[PDB]
Amino acid sequence: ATPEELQAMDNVCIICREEMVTGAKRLPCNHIFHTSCLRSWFQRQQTCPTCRMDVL
Ligand SMILES: [Zn+2]
Ligand SMILES: [Zn+2]
């Protein structure tokens, strides 16, 4: 992800509602989340942790 896109969304991972300073990806829906929270989130819920919009 980029610093401009992260700041455009509080650069905070919703999944755990913490913070994202480095080590995360960006979804095609405009929602960045921890690279660990995602792979683990989709493993149970195939929907964005915010927009729950099919991505996989
Ligand atoms: Zn997280
Ligand atoms: Zn989304």
Side-chain angles (χ1 to χ4, degrees):
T2 31
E4 184 196 34
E5 287 281 32
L6 275 164
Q7 247 246 344
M9 59 142 286
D10 301 287
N11 77 279
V12 154
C13 177
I14 204 307
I15 300 149
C16 58
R17 280 216 270 278
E18 288 291 282
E19 226 204 308
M20 277 172 306
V21 277
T22 182
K25 325 287 240 88
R26 177 168 62 75
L27 297 174
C29 45
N30 213 325
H31 301 129
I32 293 139
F33 308 104
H34 287 141
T35 301
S36 266
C37 293
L38 282 182
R39 297 196 70 184
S40 275
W41 176 277
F42 296 135
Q43 274 262 122
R44 305 215 248 167
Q45 274 66 232
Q46 193 125 317
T47 11
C48 224
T50 188
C51 82
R52 75 131 191 168
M53 190 212 74
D54 154 292
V55 284
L56 226 147

mmCIF file of all heavy atoms in Angstrom, residues 12-47:
data_model
loop_
_atom_site.group_PDB
_atom_site.id
_atom_site.type_symbol
_atom_site.label_atom_id
_atom_site.label_comp_id
_atom_site.label_asym_id
_atom_site.label_seq_id
_atom_site.Cartn_x
_atom_site.Cartn_y
_atom_site.Cartn_z
ATOM 1 N N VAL A 12 -5.800 2.771 9.521
ATOM 2 C CA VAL A 12 -6.054 1.894 10.657
ATOM 3 C C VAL A 12 -6.816 0.644 10.226
ATOM 4 O O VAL A 12 -7.862 0.732 9.583
ATOM 5 C CB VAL A 12 -6.854 2.615 11.756
ATOM 6 C CG1 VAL A 12 -7.641 1.615 12.590
ATOM 7 C CG2 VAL A 12 -5.928 3.441 12.636
ATOM 8 N N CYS A 13 -6.284 -0.519 10.589
ATOM 9 C CA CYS A 13 -6.913 -1.788 10.240
ATOM 10 C C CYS A 13 -8.221 -1.975 11.004
ATOM 11 O O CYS A 13 -8.227 -2.058 12.232
ATOM 12 C CB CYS A 13 -5.963 -2.950 10.540
ATOM 13 S SG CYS A 13 -6.676 -4.595 10.214
ATOM 14 N N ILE A 14 -9.324 -2.039 10.268
ATOM 15 C CA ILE A 14 -10.637 -2.217 10.874
ATOM 16 C C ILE A 14 -10.756 -3.586 11.538
ATOM 17 O O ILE A 14 -11.220 -3.698 12.673
ATOM 18 C CB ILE A 14 -11.765 -2.064 9.836
ATOM 19 C CG1 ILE A 14 -13.070 -1.659 10.523
ATOM 20 C CG2 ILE A 14 -11.948 -3.359 9.059
ATOM 21 C CD1 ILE A 14 -13.467 -2.579 11.656
ATOM 22 N N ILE A 15 -10.331 -4.623 10.823
ATOM 23 C CA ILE A 15 -10.386 -5.983 11.344
ATOM 24 C C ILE A 15 -10.153 -6.005 12.850
ATOM 25 O O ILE A 15 -10.920 -6.609 13.599
ATOM 26 C CB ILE A 15 -9.345 -6.889 10.660
ATOM 27 C CG1 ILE A 15 -9.601 -6.951 9.154
ATOM 28 C CG2 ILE A 15 -9.378 -8.284 11.268
ATOM 29 C CD1 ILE A 15 -8.345 -7.152 8.335
ATOM 30 N N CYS A 16 -9.090 -5.340 13.288
ATOM 31 C CA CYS A 16 -8.755 -5.280 14.707
ATOM 32 C C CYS A 16 -8.849 -3.850 15.229
ATOM 33 O O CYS A 16 -8.660 -3.599 16.419
ATOM 34 C CB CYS A 16 -7.346 -5.831 14.942
ATOM 35 S SG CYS A 16 -6.044 -4.965 14.008
ATOM 36 N N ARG A 17 -9.140 -2.917 14.329
ATOM 37 C CA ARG A 17 -9.259 -1.511 14.699
ATOM 38 C C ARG A 17 -8.056 -1.062 15.525
ATOM 39 O O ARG A 17 -8.200 -0.673 16.684
ATOM 40 C CB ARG A 17 -10.549 -1.275 15.486
ATOM 41 C CG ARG A 17 -11.785 -1.160 14.609
ATOM 42 C CD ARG A 17 -12.771 -0.146 15.166
ATOM 43 N NE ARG A 17 -13.728 -0.759 16.083
ATOM 44 C CZ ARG A 17 -14.815 -1.410 15.684
ATOM 45 N NH1 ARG A 17 -15.082 -1.530 14.391
ATOM 46 N NH2 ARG A 17 -15.638 -1.941 16.579
ATOM 47 N N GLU A 18 -6.874 -1.123 14.921
ATOM 48 C CA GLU A 18 -5.648 -0.725 15.604
ATOM 49 C C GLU A 18 -4.935 0.385 14.838
ATOM 50 O O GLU A 18 -5.239 1.565 15.009
ATOM 51 C CB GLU A 18 -4.715 -1.929 15.766
ATOM 52 C CG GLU A 18 -5.190 -2.931 16.804
ATOM 53 C CD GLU A 18 -5.117 -2.386 18.217
ATOM 54 O OE1 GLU A 18 -4.005 -2.359 18.785
ATOM 55 O OE2 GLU A 18 -6.171 -1.988 18.755
ATOM 56 N N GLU A 19 -3.985 -0.002 13.992
ATOM 57 C CA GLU A 19 -3.229 0.961 13.200
ATOM 58 C C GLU A 19 -2.371 0.252 12.156
ATOM 59 O O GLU A 19 -1.949 -0.886 12.352
ATOM 60 C CB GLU A 19 -2.343 1.816 14.109
ATOM 61 C CG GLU A 19 -2.409 3.301 13.800
ATOM 62 C CD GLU A 19 -1.175 4.051 14.263
ATOM 63 O OE1 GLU A 19 -0.806 3.909 15.448
ATOM 64 O OE2 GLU A 19 -0.579 4.778 13.443
ATOM 65 N N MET A 20 -2.118 0.935 11.045
ATOM 66 C CA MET A 20 -1.310 0.373 9.968
ATOM 67 C C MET A 20 -0.219 1.348 9.541
ATOM 68 O O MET A 20 -0.475 2.295 8.796
ATOM 69 C CB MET A 20 -2.194 0.020 8.769
ATOM 70 C CG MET A 20 -2.882 -1.329 8.899
ATOM 71 S SD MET A 20 -4.082 -1.624 7.585
ATOM 72 C CE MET A 20 -5.096 -0.153 7.715
ATOM 73 N N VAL A 21 1.000 1.111 10.015
ATOM 74 C CA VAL A 21 2.131 1.968 9.680
ATOM 75 C C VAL A 21 2.992 1.341 8.589
ATOM 76 O O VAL A 21 3.637 2.044 7.812
ATOM 77 C CB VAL A 21 3.009 2.245 10.915
ATOM 78 C CG1 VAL A 21 2.430 3.386 11.737
ATOM 79 C CG2 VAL A 21 3.153 0.987 11.760
ATOM 80 N N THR A 22 2.995 0.014 8.534
ATOM 81 C CA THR A 22 3.776 -0.709 7.538
ATOM 82 C C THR A 22 3.514 -2.210 7.617
ATOM 83 O O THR A 22 3.416 -2.776 8.703
ATOM 84 C CB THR A 22 5.285 -0.453 7.713
ATOM 85 O OG1 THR A 22 6.019 -1.140 6.694
ATOM 86 C CG2 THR A 22 5.756 -0.913 9.083
ATOM 87 N N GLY A 23 3.404 -2.847 6.455
ATOM 88 C CA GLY A 23 3.156 -4.276 6.416
ATOM 89 C C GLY A 23 1.696 -4.605 6.169
ATOM 90 O O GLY A 23 1.101 -5.399 6.896
ATOM 91 N N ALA A 24 1.118 -3.992 5.141
ATOM 92 C CA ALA A 24 -0.280 -4.223 4.800
ATOM 93 C C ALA A 24 -0.506 -4.103 3.297
ATOM 94 O O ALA A 24 0.338 -3.574 2.572
ATOM 95 C CB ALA A 24 -1.174 -3.248 5.550
ATOM 96 N N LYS A 25 -1.650 -4.595 2.835
ATOM 97 C CA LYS A 25 -1.988 -4.542 1.417
ATOM 98 C C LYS A 25 -3.172 -3.610 1.175
ATOM 99 O O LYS A 25 -3.690 -2.995 2.107
ATOM 100 C CB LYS A 25 -2.315 -5.944 0.897
ATOM 101 C CG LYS A 25 -1.490 -7.042 1.548
ATOM 102 C CD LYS A 25 -0.052 -7.025 1.056
ATOM 103 C CE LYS A 25 0.318 -8.333 0.373
ATOM 104 N NZ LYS A 25 -0.009 -8.313 -1.079
ATOM 105 N N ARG A 26 -3.595 -3.514 -0.082
ATOM 106 C CA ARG A 26 -4.718 -2.657 -0.445
ATOM 107 C C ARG A 26 -5.733 -3.421 -1.292
ATOM 108 O O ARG A 26 -5.373 -4.071 -2.274
ATOM 109 C CB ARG A 26 -4.223 -1.428 -1.209
ATOM 110 C CG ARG A 26 -5.341 -0.515 -1.685
ATOM 111 C CD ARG A 26 -4.800 0.822 -2.168
ATOM 112 N NE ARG A 26 -3.907 0.670 -3.313
ATOM 113 C CZ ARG A 26 -4.330 0.405 -4.544
ATOM 114 N NH1 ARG A 26 -5.626 0.266 -4.789
ATOM 115 N NH2 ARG A 26 -3.456 0.281 -5.534
ATOM 116 N N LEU A 27 -7.000 -3.338 -0.903
ATOM 117 C CA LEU A 27 -8.067 -4.023 -1.625
ATOM 118 C C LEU A 27 -8.547 -3.186 -2.807
ATOM 119 O O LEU A 27 -8.460 -1.959 -2.805
ATOM 120 C CB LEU A 27 -9.237 -4.319 -0.685
ATOM 121 C CG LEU A 27 -8.943 -5.267 0.476
ATOM 122 C CD1 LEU A 27 -10.139 -5.354 1.412
ATOM 123 C CD2 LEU A 27 -8.570 -6.647 -0.045
ATOM 124 N N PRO A 28 -9.068 -3.865 -3.841
ATOM 125 C CA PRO A 28 -9.575 -3.205 -5.046
ATOM 126 C C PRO A 28 -10.860 -2.426 -4.785
ATOM 127 O O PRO A 28 -11.448 -1.853 -5.701
ATOM 128 C CB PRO A 28 -9.842 -4.369 -6.002
ATOM 129 C CG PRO A 28 -10.075 -5.543 -5.115
ATOM 130 C CD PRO A 28 -9.202 -5.331 -3.910
ATOM 131 N N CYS A 29 -11.289 -2.409 -3.528
ATOM 132 C CA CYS A 29 -12.504 -1.699 -3.144
ATOM 133 C C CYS A 29 -12.170 -0.417 -2.385
ATOM 134 O O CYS A 29 -13.061 0.325 -1.979
ATOM 135 C CB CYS A 29 -13.394 -2.598 -2.281
ATOM 136 S SG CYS A 29 -12.497 -3.503 -0.981
ATOM 137 N N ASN A 30 -10.878 -0.167 -2.200
ATOM 138 C CA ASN A 30 -10.425 1.025 -1.491
ATOM 139 C C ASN A 30 -10.463 0.806 0.019
ATOM 140 O O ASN A 30 -10.986 1.635 0.764
ATOM 141 C CB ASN A 30 -11.293 2.227 -1.865
ATOM 142 C CG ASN A 30 -10.508 3.525 -1.877
ATOM 143 O OD1 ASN A 30 -9.600 3.722 -1.069
ATOM 144 N ND2 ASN A 30 -10.858 4.418 -2.796
ATOM 145 N N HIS A 31 -9.906 -0.317 0.464
ATOM 146 C CA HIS A 31 -9.875 -0.644 1.884
ATOM 147 C C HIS A 31 -8.622 -1.443 2.230
ATOM 148 O O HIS A 31 -8.493 -2.607 1.851
ATOM 149 C CB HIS A 31 -11.123 -1.436 2.273
ATOM 150 C CG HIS A 31 -12.405 -0.714 1.993
ATOM 151 N ND1 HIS A 31 -13.448 -1.279 1.291
ATOM 152 C CD2 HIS A 31 -12.807 0.536 2.322
ATOM 153 C CE1 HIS A 31 -14.439 -0.407 1.201
ATOM 154 N NE2 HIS A 31 -14.074 0.702 1.820
ATOM 155 N N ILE A 32 -7.704 -0.810 2.951
ATOM 156 C CA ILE A 32 -6.461 -1.461 3.348
ATOM 157 C C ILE A 32 -6.580 -2.069 4.742
ATOM 158 O O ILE A 32 -7.186 -1.480 5.638
ATOM 159 C CB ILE A 32 -5.277 -0.477 3.328
ATOM 160 C CG1 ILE A 32 -4.969 -0.043 1.893
ATOM 161 C CG2 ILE A 32 -4.051 -1.110 3.971
ATOM 162 C CD1 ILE A 32 -4.642 1.427 1.764
ATOM 163 N N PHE A 33 -5.996 -3.250 4.917
ATOM 164 C CA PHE A 33 -6.037 -3.938 6.203
ATOM 165 C C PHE A 33 -4.790 -4.794 6.400
ATOM 166 O O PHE A 33 -4.164 -5.231 5.433
ATOM 167 C CB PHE A 33 -7.290 -4.810 6.300
ATOM 168 C CG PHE A 33 -8.560 -4.070 5.996
ATOM 169 C CD1 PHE A 33 -9.205 -4.244 4.780
ATOM 170 C CD2 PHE A 33 -9.112 -3.202 6.922
ATOM 171 C CE1 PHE A 33 -10.374 -3.564 4.497
ATOM 172 C CE2 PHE A 33 -10.280 -2.519 6.645
ATOM 173 C CZ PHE A 33 -10.913 -2.701 5.431
ATOM 174 N N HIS A 34 -4.434 -5.033 7.659
ATOM 175 C CA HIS A 34 -3.262 -5.837 7.983
ATOM 176 C C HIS A 34 -3.179 -7.064 7.080
ATOM 177 O O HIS A 34 -4.184 -7.727 6.819
ATOM 178 C CB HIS A 34 -3.305 -6.270 9.449
ATOM 179 C CG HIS A 34 -3.019 -5.158 10.411
ATOM 180 N ND1 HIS A 34 -3.690 -5.005 11.606
ATOM 181 C CD2 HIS A 34 -2.124 -4.143 10.350
ATOM 182 C CE1 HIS A 34 -3.222 -3.942 12.237
ATOM 183 N NE2 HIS A 34 -2.272 -3.403 11.496
ATOM 184 N N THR A 35 -1.973 -7.361 6.605
ATOM 185 C CA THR A 35 -1.759 -8.507 5.729
ATOM 186 C C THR A 35 -2.015 -9.817 6.466
ATOM 187 O O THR A 35 -2.212 -10.861 5.845
ATOM 188 C CB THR A 35 -0.326 -8.521 5.163
ATOM 189 O OG1 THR A 35 -0.078 -7.318 4.429
ATOM 190 C CG2 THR A 35 -0.113 -9.725 4.260
ATOM 191 N N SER A 36 -2.013 -9.754 7.793
ATOM 192 C CA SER A 36 -2.241 -10.937 8.615
ATOM 193 C C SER A 36 -3.714 -11.060 8.993
ATOM 194 O O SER A 36 -4.240 -12.164 9.141
ATOM 195 C CB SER A 36 -1.381 -10.881 9.879
ATOM 196 O OG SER A 36 -0.153 -11.562 9.692
ATOM 197 N N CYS A 37 -4.376 -9.917 9.146
ATOM 198 C CA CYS A 37 -5.787 -9.893 9.508
ATOM 199 C C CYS A 37 -6.660 -10.285 8.318
ATOM 200 O O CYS A 37 -7.731 -10.871 8.486
ATOM 201 C CB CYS A 37 -6.184 -8.503 10.009
ATOM 202 S SG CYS A 37 -5.401 -8.030 11.584
ATOM 203 N N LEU A 38 -6.195 -9.958 7.117
ATOM 204 C CA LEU A 38 -6.931 -10.276 5.899
ATOM 205 C C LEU A 38 -6.906 -11.775 5.622
ATOM 206 O O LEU A 38 -7.937 -12.445 5.681
ATOM 207 C CB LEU A 38 -6.340 -9.516 4.710
ATOM 208 C CG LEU A 38 -6.714 -8.037 4.606
ATOM 209 C CD1 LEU A 38 -6.099 -7.418 3.360
ATOM 210 C CD2 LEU A 38 -8.226 -7.869 4.597
ATOM 211 N N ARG A 39 -5.719 -12.297 5.325
ATOM 212 C CA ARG A 39 -5.560 -13.718 5.040
ATOM 213 C C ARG A 39 -6.257 -14.566 6.100
ATOM 214 O O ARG A 39 -6.655 -15.701 5.838
ATOM 215 C CB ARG A 39 -4.076 -14.082 4.975
ATOM 216 C CG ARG A 39 -3.327 -13.387 3.850
ATOM 217 C CD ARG A 39 -1.991 -14.060 3.571
ATOM 218 N NE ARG A 39 -2.158 -15.371 2.950
ATOM 219 C CZ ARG A 39 -1.147 -16.186 2.671
ATOM 220 N NH1 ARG A 39 0.097 -15.825 2.955
ATOM 221 N NH2 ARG A 39 -1.379 -17.363 2.106
ATOM 222 N N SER A 40 -6.400 -14.008 7.298
ATOM 223 C CA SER A 40 -7.044 -14.713 8.399
ATOM 224 C C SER A 40 -8.534 -14.393 8.452
ATOM 225 O O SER A 40 -9.334 -15.188 8.945
ATOM 226 C CB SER A 40 -6.384 -14.342 9.727
ATOM 227 O OG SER A 40 -5.240 -15.146 9.971
ATOM 228 N N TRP A 41 -8.899 -13.222 7.942
ATOM 229 C CA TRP A 41 -10.294 -12.795 7.930
ATOM 230 C C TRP A 41 -11.069 -13.496 6.821
ATOM 231 O O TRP A 41 -12.190 -13.959 7.031
ATOM 232 C CB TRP A 41 -10.381 -11.278 7.751
ATOM 233 C CG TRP A 41 -11.788 -10.775 7.632
ATOM 234 C CD1 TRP A 41 -12.555 -10.743 6.501
ATOM 235 C CD2 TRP A 41 -12.597 -10.231 8.682
ATOM 236 N NE1 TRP A 41 -13.789 -10.211 6.786
ATOM 237 C CE2 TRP A 41 -13.840 -9.890 8.116
ATOM 238 C CE3 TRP A 41 -12.390 -10.000 10.043
ATOM 239 C CZ2 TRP A 41 -14.870 -9.330 8.867
ATOM 240 C CZ3 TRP A 41 -13.413 -9.445 10.788
ATOM 241 C CH2 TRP A 41 -14.641 -9.115 10.198
ATOM 242 N N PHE A 42 -10.465 -13.573 5.640
ATOM 243 C CA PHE A 42 -11.101 -14.217 4.496
ATOM 244 C C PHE A 42 -11.182 -15.727 4.700
ATOM 245 O O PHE A 42 -11.985 -16.407 4.061
ATOM 246 C CB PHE A 42 -10.328 -13.905 3.213
ATOM 247 C CG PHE A 42 -10.327 -12.446 2.854
ATOM 248 C CD1 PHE A 42 -9.159 -11.821 2.449
ATOM 249 C CD2 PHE A 42 -11.493 -11.701 2.923
ATOM 250 C CE1 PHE A 42 -9.154 -10.478 2.118
ATOM 251 C CE2 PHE A 42 -11.495 -10.359 2.593
ATOM 252 C CZ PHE A 42 -10.323 -9.747 2.190
ATOM 253 N N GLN A 43 -10.345 -16.244 5.594
ATOM 254 C CA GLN A 43 -10.321 -17.673 5.881
ATOM 255 C C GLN A 43 -11.615 -18.115 6.557
ATOM 256 O O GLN A 43 -11.861 -19.309 6.728
ATOM 257 C CB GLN A 43 -9.124 -18.016 6.771
ATOM 258 C CG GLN A 43 -7.841 -18.262 5.994
ATOM 259 C CD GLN A 43 -7.572 -19.736 5.761
ATOM 260 O OE1 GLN A 43 -7.445 -20.183 4.620
ATOM 261 N NE2 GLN A 43 -7.486 -20.500 6.843
ATOM 262 N N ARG A 44 -12.439 -17.144 6.938
ATOM 263 C CA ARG A 44 -13.707 -17.433 7.596
ATOM 264 C C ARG A 44 -14.835 -16.601 6.992
ATOM 265 O O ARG A 44 -15.975 -17.054 6.906
ATOM 266 C CB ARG A 44 -13.602 -17.155 9.096
ATOM 267 C CG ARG A 44 -12.460 -17.895 9.774
ATOM 268 C CD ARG A 44 -12.828 -18.311 11.190
ATOM 269 N NE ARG A 44 -12.054 -17.585 12.193
ATOM 270 C CZ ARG A 44 -12.355 -17.576 13.488
ATOM 271 N NH1 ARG A 44 -13.404 -18.252 13.932
ATOM 272 N NH2 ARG A 44 -11.602 -16.891 14.339
ATOM 273 N N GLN A 45 -14.507 -15.382 6.577
ATOM 274 C CA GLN A 45 -15.494 -14.488 5.982
ATOM 275 C C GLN A 45 -14.993 -13.932 4.652
ATOM 276 O O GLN A 45 -14.147 -13.039 4.622
ATOM 277 C CB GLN A 45 -15.814 -13.338 6.940
ATOM 278 C CG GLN A 45 -16.906 -13.671 7.944
ATOM 279 C CD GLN A 45 -16.491 -14.755 8.919
ATOM 280 O OE1 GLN A 45 -17.198 -15.747 9.099
ATOM 281 N NE2 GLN A 45 -15.339 -14.573 9.555
ATOM 282 N N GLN A 46 -15.522 -14.466 3.558
ATOM 283 C CA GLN A 46 -15.127 -14.024 2.224
ATOM 284 C C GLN A 46 -15.763 -12.679 1.887
ATOM 285 O O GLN A 46 -16.375 -12.517 0.832
ATOM 286 C CB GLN A 46 -15.528 -15.067 1.179
ATOM 287 C CG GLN A 46 -14.878 -14.847 -0.178
ATOM 288 C CD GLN A 46 -14.114 -16.064 -0.663
ATOM 289 O OE1 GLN A 46 -13.400 -16.709 0.104
ATOM 290 N NE2 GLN A 46 -14.262 -16.383 -1.943
ATOM 291 N N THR A 47 -15.614 -11.716 2.791
ATOM 292 C CA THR A 47 -16.173 -10.385 2.590
ATOM 293 C C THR A 47 -15.369 -9.331 3.343
ATOM 294 O O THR A 47 -14.907 -9.568 4.460
ATOM 295 C CB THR A 47 -17.642 -10.318 3.050
ATOM 296 O OG1 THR A 47 -17.978 -11.498 3.790
ATOM 297 C CG2 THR A 47 -18.576 -10.180 1.858
#
